[PDB]
mmCIF file of C-alpha atoms (C1' of nucleotides) in Angstrom:
data_model
loop_
_atom_site.group_PDB
_atom_site.id
_atom_site.type_symbol
_atom_site.label_atom_id
_atom_site.label_comp_id
_atom_site.label_asym_id
_atom_site.label_seq_id
_atom_site.Cartn_x
_atom_site.Cartn_y
_atom_site.Cartn_z
ATOM 1 C CA UNK A 1 0.000 0.000 0.000
ATOM 2 C CA UNK A 2 1.122 3.569 -0.778
ATOM 3 C CA UNK A 3 -0.522 7.025 -0.733
ATOM 4 C CA UNK A 4 0.767 7.951 -4.223
ATOM 5 C CA UNK A 5 -1.686 6.579 -6.814
ATOM 6 C CA UNK A 6 -2.860 7.579 -10.306
ATOM 7 C CA UNK A 7 -5.468 5.065 -11.571
ATOM 8 C CA UNK A 8 -4.082 5.549 -15.126
ATOM 9 C CA UNK A 9 -2.777 1.996 -15.644
ATOM 10 C CA UNK A 10 -1.745 0.530 -19.018
ATOM 11 C CA UNK A 11 -5.124 -1.287 -19.005
ATOM 12 C CA UNK A 12 -3.520 -4.705 -18.344
ATOM 13 C CA UNK A 13 -3.671 -5.578 -14.616
ATOM 14 C CA UNK A 14 -7.084 -6.620 -13.237
ATOM 15 C CA UNK A 15 -7.905 -6.501 -9.517
ATOM 16 C CA UNK A 16 -10.205 -9.208 -8.093
ATOM 17 C CA UNK A 17 -11.596 -9.528 -4.536
ATOM 18 C CA UNK A 18 -14.504 -11.981 -3.903
ATOM 19 C CA UNK A 19 -12.434 -15.188 -3.933
ATOM 20 C CA UNK A 20 -13.380 -18.509 -2.291
ATOM 21 C CA UNK A 21 -10.207 -19.415 -0.332
ATOM 22 C CA UNK A 22 -8.293 -22.182 -2.163
ATOM 23 C CA UNK A 23 -8.399 -20.445 -5.563
ATOM 24 C CA UNK A 24 -4.554 -20.506 -5.580
ATOM 25 C CA UNK A 25 -4.071 -20.136 -9.359
ATOM 26 C CA UNK A 26 -6.440 -22.960 -10.367
ATOM 27 C CA UNK A 27 -9.364 -21.164 -12.075
ATOM 28 C CA UNK A 28 -7.915 -17.768 -13.070
ATOM 29 C CA UNK A 29 -6.015 -19.652 -15.791
ATOM 30 C CA UNK A 30 -9.421 -20.983 -16.900
ATOM 31 C CA UNK A 31 -11.515 -17.784 -16.691
ATOM 32 C CA UNK A 32 -8.808 -15.357 -17.833
ATOM 33 C CA UNK A 33 -7.324 -18.033 -20.126
ATOM 34 C CA UNK A 34 -9.695 -17.733 -23.138
ATOM 35 C CA UNK A 35 -9.523 -13.916 -22.811
ATOM 36 C CA UNK A 36 -5.846 -13.648 -23.799
ATOM 37 C CA UNK A 37 -2.278 -14.989 -23.427
ATOM 38 C CA UNK A 38 -2.298 -13.687 -19.785
ATOM 39 C CA UNK A 39 1.321 -12.856 -18.868
ATOM 40 C CA UNK A 40 0.795 -13.712 -15.191
ATOM 41 C CA UNK A 41 -1.710 -14.086 -12.349
ATOM 42 C CA UNK A 42 -0.736 -13.060 -8.810
ATOM 43 C CA UNK A 43 -3.318 -14.411 -6.360
ATOM 44 C CA UNK A 44 -2.831 -13.810 -2.636
ATOM 45 C CA UNK A 45 -4.776 -13.635 0.638
ATOM 46 C CA UNK A 46 -8.029 -11.750 -0.050
ATOM 47 C CA UNK A 47 -7.463 -10.754 -3.709
ATOM 48 C CA UNK A 48 -5.641 -11.289 -7.020
ATOM 49 C CA UNK A 49 -4.128 -9.435 -9.967
ATOM 50 C CA UNK A 50 -4.197 -10.941 -13.480
ATOM 51 C CA UNK A 51 -2.146 -9.296 -16.264
ATOM 52 C CA UNK A 52 -2.317 -9.373 -20.094
ATOM 53 C CA UNK A 53 -0.054 -8.783 -23.114
ATOM 54 C CA UNK A 54 -2.543 -6.359 -24.690
ATOM 55 C CA UNK A 55 -4.779 -3.603 -23.324
ATOM 56 C CA UNK A 56 -7.577 -5.159 -25.391
ATOM 57 C CA UNK A 57 -7.347 -8.630 -23.817
ATOM 58 C CA UNK A 58 -7.459 -7.113 -20.324
ATOM 59 C CA UNK A 59 -10.392 -4.753 -20.998
ATOM 60 C CA UNK A 60 -12.260 -7.679 -22.595
ATOM 61 C CA UNK A 61 -11.800 -9.946 -19.566
ATOM 62 C CA UNK A 62 -12.750 -7.226 -17.057
ATOM 63 C CA UNK A 63 -15.799 -6.357 -19.188
ATOM 64 C CA UNK A 64 -16.892 -10.015 -19.051
ATOM 65 C CA UNK A 65 -15.690 -11.048 -15.555
ATOM 66 C CA UNK A 66 -16.799 -7.941 -13.576
ATOM 67 C CA UNK A 67 -20.375 -9.308 -13.624
ATOM 68 C CA UNK A 68 -20.293 -13.115 -13.201
ATOM 69 C CA UNK A 69 -19.129 -15.795 -10.736
ATOM 70 C CA UNK A 70 -16.425 -18.424 -10.223
ATOM 71 C CA UNK A 71 -17.111 -19.270 -6.558
ATOM 72 C CA UNK A 72 -20.866 -18.762 -6.017
ATOM 73 C CA UNK A 73 -19.972 -15.079 -5.469
ATOM 74 C CA UNK A 74 -20.555 -12.054 -7.743
ATOM 75 C CA UNK A 75 -17.260 -10.844 -9.219
ATOM 76 C CA UNK A 76 -16.706 -7.108 -9.780
ATOM 77 C CA UNK A 77 -13.181 -6.868 -11.266
ATOM 78 C CA UNK A 78 -11.644 -3.409 -11.740
ATOM 79 C CA UNK A 79 -8.327 -1.892 -12.838
ATOM 80 C CA UNK A 80 -5.304 -2.419 -10.565
ATOM 81 C CA UNK A 81 -2.447 -0.131 -9.467
ATOM 82 C CA UNK A 82 0.085 0.935 -12.117
ATOM 83 C CA UNK A 83 2.315 -1.890 -13.459
ATOM 84 C CA UNK A 84 5.954 -0.779 -13.385
ATOM 85 C CA UNK A 85 9.529 -2.043 -13.768
ATOM 86 C CA UNK A 86 12.105 -1.530 -11.006
ATOM 87 C CA UNK A 87 15.868 -1.996 -10.665
ATOM 88 C CA UNK A 88 18.053 -4.336 -8.600
ATOM 89 C CA UNK A 89 21.774 -4.925 -8.043
ATOM 90 C CA UNK A 90 24.024 -7.592 -6.531
ATOM 91 C CA UNK A 91 25.876 -6.585 -3.362
ATOM 92 C CA UNK A 92 28.507 -8.229 -1.175
ATOM 93 C CA UNK A 93 29.221 -7.617 2.507
ATOM 94 C CA UNK A 94 30.139 -9.470 5.732
ATOM 95 C CA UNK A 95 28.156 -12.075 7.746
ATOM 96 C CA UNK A 96 27.558 -9.770 10.736
ATOM 97 C CA UNK A 97 25.657 -6.691 11.936
ATOM 98 C CA UNK A 98 23.367 -6.692 8.868
ATOM 99 C CA UNK A 99 19.669 -7.063 7.998
ATOM 100 C CA UNK A 100 17.483 -5.513 5.272
ATOM 101 C CA UNK A 101 16.613 -2.825 7.859
ATOM 102 C CA UNK A 102 20.257 -1.713 8.128
ATOM 103 C CA UNK A 103 20.816 -1.617 4.356
ATOM 104 C CA UNK A 104 17.706 0.604 4.100
ATOM 105 C CA UNK A 105 19.085 3.029 6.693
ATOM 106 C CA UNK A 106 22.569 2.777 5.163
ATOM 107 C CA UNK A 107 21.344 3.602 1.660
ATOM 108 C CA UNK A 108 19.161 6.505 2.832
ATOM 109 C CA UNK A 109 21.890 8.125 4.972
ATOM 110 C CA UNK A 110 24.085 8.874 1.922
ATOM 111 C CA UNK A 111 21.813 10.329 -0.778
ATOM 112 C CA UNK A 112 19.900 7.526 -2.525
ATOM 113 C CA UNK A 113 17.060 5.357 -1.177
ATOM 114 C CA UNK A 114 15.894 1.743 -1.648
ATOM 115 C CA UNK A 115 12.343 0.673 -2.485
ATOM 116 C CA UNK A 116 13.300 -2.795 -1.170
ATOM 117 C CA UNK A 117 16.249 -4.579 0.504
ATOM 118 C CA UNK A 118 17.276 -8.247 0.745
ATOM 119 C CA UNK A 119 19.876 -10.579 2.274
ATOM 120 C CA UNK A 120 19.093 -13.832 0.444
ATOM 121 C CA UNK A 121 21.666 -16.294 1.815
ATOM 122 C CA UNK A 122 21.091 -19.629 3.606
ATOM 123 C CA UNK A 123 24.028 -19.440 6.038
ATOM 124 C CA UNK A 124 23.852 -15.625 6.246
ATOM 125 C CA UNK A 125 26.901 -14.474 4.282
ATOM 126 C CA UNK A 126 26.182 -10.760 4.791
ATOM 127 C CA UNK A 127 25.761 -10.492 1.009
ATOM 128 C CA UNK A 128 22.334 -9.729 -0.490
ATOM 129 C CA UNK A 129 20.766 -7.326 -3.004
ATOM 130 C CA UNK A 130 19.047 -3.913 -3.176
ATOM 131 C CA UNK A 131 16.069 -2.658 -5.191
ATOM 132 C CA UNK A 132 15.677 0.766 -6.875
ATOM 133 C CA UNK A 133 12.772 2.784 -8.363
ATOM 134 C CA UNK A 134 14.761 3.515 -11.574
ATOM 135 C CA UNK A 135 18.175 3.199 -13.273
ATOM 136 C CA UNK A 136 19.185 6.755 -12.297
ATOM 137 C CA UNK A 137 19.567 5.449 -8.722
ATOM 138 C CA UNK A 138 21.429 2.270 -9.745
ATOM 139 C CA UNK A 139 24.147 4.087 -11.733
ATOM 140 C CA UNK A 140 24.598 6.359 -8.695
ATOM 141 C CA UNK A 141 24.494 3.647 -6.013
ATOM 142 C CA UNK A 142 27.538 1.945 -7.572
ATOM 143 C CA UNK A 143 29.490 5.168 -6.920
ATOM 144 C CA UNK A 144 28.019 6.339 -3.586
ATOM 145 C CA UNK A 145 26.924 3.114 -1.855
ATOM 146 C CA UNK A 146 30.038 1.348 -3.225
ATOM 147 C CA UNK A 147 32.766 0.407 -0.702
ATOM 148 C CA UNK A 148 31.758 3.177 1.750
ATOM 149 C CA UNK A 149 32.907 0.923 4.643
ATOM 150 C CA UNK A 150 29.714 -0.068 6.470
ATOM 151 C CA UNK A 151 30.088 -1.078 10.144
ATOM 152 C CA UNK A 152 33.713 -1.894 9.202
ATOM 153 C CA UNK A 153 32.459 -4.166 6.388
ATOM 154 C CA UNK A 154 32.426 -3.334 2.653
ATOM 155 C CA UNK A 155 29.490 -3.004 0.245
ATOM 156 C CA UNK A 156 30.188 -4.328 -3.266
ATOM 157 C CA UNK A 157 26.971 -3.016 -4.834
ATOM 158 C CA UNK A 158 27.250 -3.664 -8.582
ATOM 159 C CA UNK A 159 24.757 -4.110 -11.432
ATOM 160 C CA UNK A 160 24.242 -7.712 -12.535
ATOM 161 C CA UNK A 161 21.718 -6.570 -15.176
ATOM 162 C CA UNK A 162 18.708 -7.595 -13.080
ATOM 163 C CA UNK A 163 15.923 -9.821 -14.497
ATOM 164 C CA UNK A 164 12.292 -8.636 -14.865
ATOM 165 C CA UNK A 165 10.018 -8.494 -11.767
ATOM 166 C CA UNK A 166 9.615 -11.695 -9.727
ATOM 167 C CA UNK A 167 6.905 -14.021 -11.065
ATOM 168 C CA UNK A 168 3.948 -15.004 -8.825
ATOM 169 C CA UNK A 169 3.725 -14.786 -5.017
ATOM 170 C "C1'" A B 1 -17.059 -3.349 0.423
ATOM 171 C "C1'" U B 2 -11.172 -2.942 -2.711
ATOM 172 C "C1'" C B 3 -4.902 -3.231 -4.472
ATOM 173 C "C1'" C B 4 0.351 -6.468 -4.882
ATOM 174 C "C1'" A B 5 3.019 -6.801 -7.290
ATOM 175 C "C1'" G B 6 10.775 -9.701 -3.437
ATOM 176 C "C1'" U B 7 2.844 -10.274 0.782
ATOM 177 C "C1'" G B 8 9.351 -7.479 5.687
ATOM 178 C "C1'" G B 9 11.413 -2.811 10.686
ATOM 179 C "C1'" A B 10 15.217 -7.114 13.069
ATOM 180 C "C1'" A B 11 11.647 -10.695 9.830
#
RNA sequence: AUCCAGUGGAA
């Protein structure tokens, strides 16, 4: 959730609400399936967001699904928040004194700011990754957040040419 | 009734 909204989406994401409970990507692929190639469906507790390759396939499905049922409940699909790409980079550090909370405070106390922070490692290696709202923060982070000496450790933030947004929940 | 897109403030 965020206070900044626009409601001027690319006409592709479709927000659903009146789910049963065990929907879990088992009937969206059937209802939204014949409507278009459907890039992805992100169902989660209390709602879902289907997405299409064309503004036409999305509008068509909403026009036909916002007035029927898949769970003995009246559906009322509407347009979702604005689909958007974001940036990410690979970072290295030390297996101590770190959590995604500290990399958020670290990044924001220099000049830049992270939209998300991670420390994906099984044995906790200190290494992780950082997210950015655009490339103009990535190309700066590798010069400002690079090797600044954090807690006596060292941040090796560098661009690995991040993949597209993570698929599904 | 109704908004997440790595379902996060130590998690």
